[PDB]
What we know:
Blueprint: E1 10-14, E2 33-41, E3 44-49, E4 52-56, E5 61-63
Antiparallel strand pairs: 1-2, 1-5, 2-3, 3-4
Amino acid sequence: GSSGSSGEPIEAIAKFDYVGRTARELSFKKGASLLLYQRASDDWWEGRHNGIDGLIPHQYIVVQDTSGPSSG
Length: 72
């Protein structure tokens, strides 16, 4: 409790098929489940994909503002 503001990871869903142009970024496909750890920038994110830590675009993903997974 009263831990902080940015703690546990955020489960985001790929908005559109994206391919990490560089090693830093990550390549995913619309629908693919992506985990978020921290917002690298206003147009980027910092999480992991298929076991790969890198950057994630905010234009090809939907940052869910819900605590925990949403069954269904």
